[PDB]
């Protein structure tokens, strides 16, 4: 199956990696619910013209709360403790750990996160529907091909890399079109609003690069090594959670500041 299943069915998890991974994943869905409330309550401090941005943040949190709750209970109900051996092991009766909850929350969210900037800033030379269509297509294909490649994380590894690599090409296209978007969005706004735009670019750049980092994490130190272990599991799932807070919550928080700043023309 995946690589988490491998460790829980050949070596187990110490009670310190199981609970750490259950606490940081629960942190993940709790945040999403505080961002659901924050975005609703803030829908007023922005003009009607930018409110579709906040709405899209509200919906993105509804799908993040629900599905990250799922992934969280998918990890805790997939491993049972062995007092004899003293570690946590894959449970044959449970449903096994399954990434598909996360990856699905990615495919729902990517049009929305990408589409929403185009309600705050104004393009100059590009065409709205041209940018929109390019985002929805490559965003969807990125998450899809990345959902394929990680199926073989344990089996065909050359598949795991080459399919992720394909998912990375769509990712670099998105980065291109976001980059052009940020740029035209700076034309004819204040220096203050331009500073915030610059923030949303460094935030978009780091948060989104984290994801393939988690994808590869157990293989970043060889065929065996430090990470080829429960430690790379602890690490891959802590990185994913920081990426989910950064790209969905801090991203929308920042975009709300810009809208607010642009309310004062």
Ligand X SMILES: CCCCCCCCCCCCCCCCCCCC
Question: Could you say whether residue 101 binds ligand X (CB under 6 A)?
Answer: yes
Residue 110 near residue 142 (C-beta atoms within 8 A): yes
| Window 146 to 185, contacts with ligand RET (CB under 6 A) | 146, 164, 167-168, 171
Give the nearer residue to Na ion in terms of CB position, either 2 or 241: 2
Q: Binding string, 184-213, against ligand RET, x = CB under 6 A? A: ------------------------x--xx-
> What are the φ/ψ torsions at residue 81 (nearest 5 degrees)?
-80, 150
According to DSSP, the residues that pair with 80 across neighbouring strands are 89
Among 50, 89, 106, 135, binds ligand RET (CB under 6 A): 106
Round to whole Å and give the CA distance between 181 and 190: 16
Give the nearer residue to ligand RET in terms of CB position, either 43 or 144: 144
Choose the stretch contacting ligand X; rule: CB under 6 A; options: 57-65, 123-131, 173-181, 185-193.
57-65
Q: Is 258 helix (H, G, I), strand (E, B) or coil?
A: helix
Question: Could you say whether residue 57 binds ligand RET (CB under 6 A)?
Answer: no
Rounded (10°) angle between helices 51-76 and 15-41: 160
Task: Tell me the CA distances in angstroms from 11 to 3, 50, 87, 205, 253, one per residue in order.
Answer: 12, 52, 8, 36, 41
Question: Could you say whether residue 144 binds ligand X (CB under 6 A)?
Answer: yes
Q: Which residues bind Na ion (CB under 5 A)?
A: 2, 99
250 binds, among ligand X, ligand RET, Na ion, none (CB under 5 to 8 A by kind): ligand X
């Amino acid at each position: 199956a995946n690589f988490e299943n491998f460790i829980g069915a050949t070596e187990g998890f110490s009670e310190i990696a199981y609970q750490f991974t259950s606490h940081i994943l629960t942190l993940g869905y709790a945040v999403m619910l505080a961002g659901l409330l924050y975005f609703i309550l803030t829908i007023k401090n922005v003009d009607k013209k930018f409110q579709m941005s906040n709405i899209l943040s509200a919906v993105v949190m509804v799908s993040a709360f629900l599905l990250l709750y799922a992934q969280a209970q998918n990890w805790t109900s997939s491993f049972t403790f062995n007092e004899e051996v003293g570690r946590y092991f894959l449970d044959p009766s449970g449903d096994l750990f399954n990434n598909g909850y996360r990856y699905l929350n990615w495919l729902i969210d990517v049009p929305m996160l990408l589409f929403q900037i185009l309600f705050v800033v104004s393009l100059t030379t590009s065409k709205f529907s041209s940018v929109r269509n390019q985002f929805w297509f490559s965003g969807a294909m990125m998450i899809i091909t990345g959902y394929i490649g990680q199926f073989y994380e344990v089996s065909n590894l050359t598949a795991f890399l080459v399919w992720g690599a394909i998912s990375s090409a769509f990712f670099f296209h998105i980065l291109w079109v976001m980059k052009k978007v940020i740029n035209e969005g700076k034309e004819g706004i204040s220096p203050a609003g331009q500073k915030i735009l610059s923030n949303i670019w460094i935030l978009f750049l780091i948060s989104w690069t984290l994801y393939p980092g988690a994808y590869l994490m157990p293989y970043l130190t060889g065929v065996d090594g430090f990470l080829y272990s429960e430690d790379g599991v602890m690490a891959r799932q802590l990185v994913y959670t920081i990426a989910d807070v950064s790209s969905k919550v801090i991203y929308g928080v920042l975009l709300g500041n810009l809208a607010i700043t642009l309310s004062k023309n």
